[PDB]
Amino acid sequence: DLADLFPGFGSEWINTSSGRIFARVGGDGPPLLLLHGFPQTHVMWHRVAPKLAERFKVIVADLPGYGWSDMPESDEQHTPYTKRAMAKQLIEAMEQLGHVHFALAGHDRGARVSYRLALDSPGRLSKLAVLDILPTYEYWQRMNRAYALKIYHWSFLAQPAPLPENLLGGDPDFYVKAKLASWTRAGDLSAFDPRAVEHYRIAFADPMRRHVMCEDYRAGAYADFEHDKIDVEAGNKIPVPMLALWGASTPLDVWRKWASDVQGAPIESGHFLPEEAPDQTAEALVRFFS
Amino acid sequence: DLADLFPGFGSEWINTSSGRIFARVGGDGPPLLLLHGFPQTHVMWHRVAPKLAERFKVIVADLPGYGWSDMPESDEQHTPYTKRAMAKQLIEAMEQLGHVHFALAGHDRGARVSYRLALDSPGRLSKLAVLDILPTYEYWQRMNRAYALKIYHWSFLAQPAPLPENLLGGDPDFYVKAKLASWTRAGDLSAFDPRAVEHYRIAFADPMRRHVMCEDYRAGAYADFEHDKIDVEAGNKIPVPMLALWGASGIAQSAATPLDVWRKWASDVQGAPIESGHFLPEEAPDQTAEALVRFFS
Ligand SMILES: [Ca+2]
Numbered sequence: 001d002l003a004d005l006f007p008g009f010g011s012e013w014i015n016t017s018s019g020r021i022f023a024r025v026g027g028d029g030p031p032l033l034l035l036h037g038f039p040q041t042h043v044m045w046h047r048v049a050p051k052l053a054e055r056f057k058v059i060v061a062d063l064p065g066y067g068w069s070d071m072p073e074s075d076e077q078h079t080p081y082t083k084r085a086m087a088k089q090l091i092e093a094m095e096q097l098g099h100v101h102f103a104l105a106g107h108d109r110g111a112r113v114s115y116r117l118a119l120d121s122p123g124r125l126s127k128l129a130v131l132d133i134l135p136t137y138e139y140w141q142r143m144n145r146a147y148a149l150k151i152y153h154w155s156f157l158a159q160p161a162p163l164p165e166n167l168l169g170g171d172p173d174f175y176v177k178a179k180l181a182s183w184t185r186a187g188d189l190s191a192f193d194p195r196a197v198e199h200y201r202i203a204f205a206d207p208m209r210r211h212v213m214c215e216d217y218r219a220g221a222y223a224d225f226e227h228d229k230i231d232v233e234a235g236n237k238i239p240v241p242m243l244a245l246w247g248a249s250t251p252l253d254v255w256r257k258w259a260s261d262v263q264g265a266p267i268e269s270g271h272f273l274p275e276e277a278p279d280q281t282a283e284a285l286v287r288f289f290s
Numbered sequence: 291d292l293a294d295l296f297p298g299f300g301s302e303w304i305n306t307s308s309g310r311i312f313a314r315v316g317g318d319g320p321p322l323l324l325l326h327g328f329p330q331t332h333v334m335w336h337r338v339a340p341k342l343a344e345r346f347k348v349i350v351a352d353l354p355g356y357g358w359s360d361m362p363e364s365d366e367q368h369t370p371y372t373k374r375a376m377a378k379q380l381i382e383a384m385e386q387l388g389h390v391h392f393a394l395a396g397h398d399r400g401a402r403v404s405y406r407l408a409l410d411s412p413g414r415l416s417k418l419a420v421l422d423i424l425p426t427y428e429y430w431q432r433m434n435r436a437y438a439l440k441i442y443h444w445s446f447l448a449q450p451a452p453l454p455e456n457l458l459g460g461d462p463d464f465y466v467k468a469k470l471a472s473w474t475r476a477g478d479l480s481a482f483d484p485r486a487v488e489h490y491r492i493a494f495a496d497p498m499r500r501h502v503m504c505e506d507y508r509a510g511a512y513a514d515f516e517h518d519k520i521d522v523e524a525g526n527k528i529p530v531p532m533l534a535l536w537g538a539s540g541i542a543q544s545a546a547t548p549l550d551v552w553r554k555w556a557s558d559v560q561g562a563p564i565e566s567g568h569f570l571p572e573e574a575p576d577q578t579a580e581a582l583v584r585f586f587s
Contacts, residue, residue: 145511156445166468170456221435
């Protein structure tokens, strides 16, 4: 029993060469693509998307391999779940809708797709907002004891299959809820709509979806890092105007090294900005994208 | 139906204030305490301990909380599973046998107990051997992307309870065999006696034992690190003559050059690599046993 958390939004299955992207589409006006991260699905936008839909055509997409999007076959390099490949697939999806120049807000893994998209194909983006991330390279470059403990899952989920898949299968419901809760300000699931938690829980209950998530993190440890590294070493900066939002529980300083036009603000929230702080997140997003 | 892998060794249940230490005890001569690590038990010594027992009174102990040793209840600081506490508990155990001055060889977590013992209570040790470790501080200090991937379990098992415990609980056999396999040279279980594997698997099958292992790793991420940090920043060196053995394909050598590291920690340290994965006494029993007999003699 999965609730429709985007009343008035259409549901589109967008064909790409790598499989279907599922998206809820609402509103009218300039196209704005919203990308979720881990361990969520597009429904994480359910509290801010209607506010954006007042001014934009809002496309709330499941990342390749996530949610109801198709899961492209991975390979030894985790290619389809590299942010470069997911960005390419989402570019293809947006082209199916006739959107070759669009606004993009990404959270978590979707924000990684988003800034990789901005680096690879900046002409595709009017404006970019990234929610509660630093570039993948920065996470690995600042890897120390404190980060390793805090984002242990970056190294755990990146272990070779089937180690994470098997351990995740030990208690998937616990794991996804533990991830949701532990990264909120409150530390529990109270920030979330329980119908949204059900979406996340059901997606996480599928072993194939969990494997994709590990592929994403495997990409995150390997090719994504290498792709970011090439840009760092080449001085490649994001030229799209961008907003960096982060949960108070210095990202702007970091993003300034990656982006030529970045503004930023802390949001009184944990990691899940659009759900813990939907009004402030939605406000900042409309202000920026308007 | 767990095999006796120490024929002719006795068995001792040693009372301490923090619970009983199980140990196999054999040989005669100077006391030599052997400490296993994760995810093993004292039986990992079963191929080298008889050779040692020709020269030494060999005490092959399960670490506090591991194997058949009792499991003291942990606390918010994981105190009984800090290497400091384990060392004090094993010192107490050894005193019960009348060993107030003994040789010590540790592997993995037991090697962490061992060098912490040597830092806290160096007068208890005649000589110290640590097998395939660097100090906990050094692993954390060198925890970059490559190392965080290699020893992810350092951060995974240190996650707050019950996260690792819940994931381990779904298929404990898989994880213990995965870790045994992945840290060997071959990358499989072929180096191990299958009877020893059964010991490891049975110990790991107990959810309380798994929790203790996570507590060990939690202590490893927090108090153990802090204890080490104080010593390294105070320039405190182990004064006990020590031997650092590591596997050419082991974990220690992935973080740095182990002898260079240990010389920062120990005033009198010799080192040798052994062609082996992490599990020196089982992958390379003869070479390990020879290095230890030679050093402790
Ligand atoms: Ca459970």
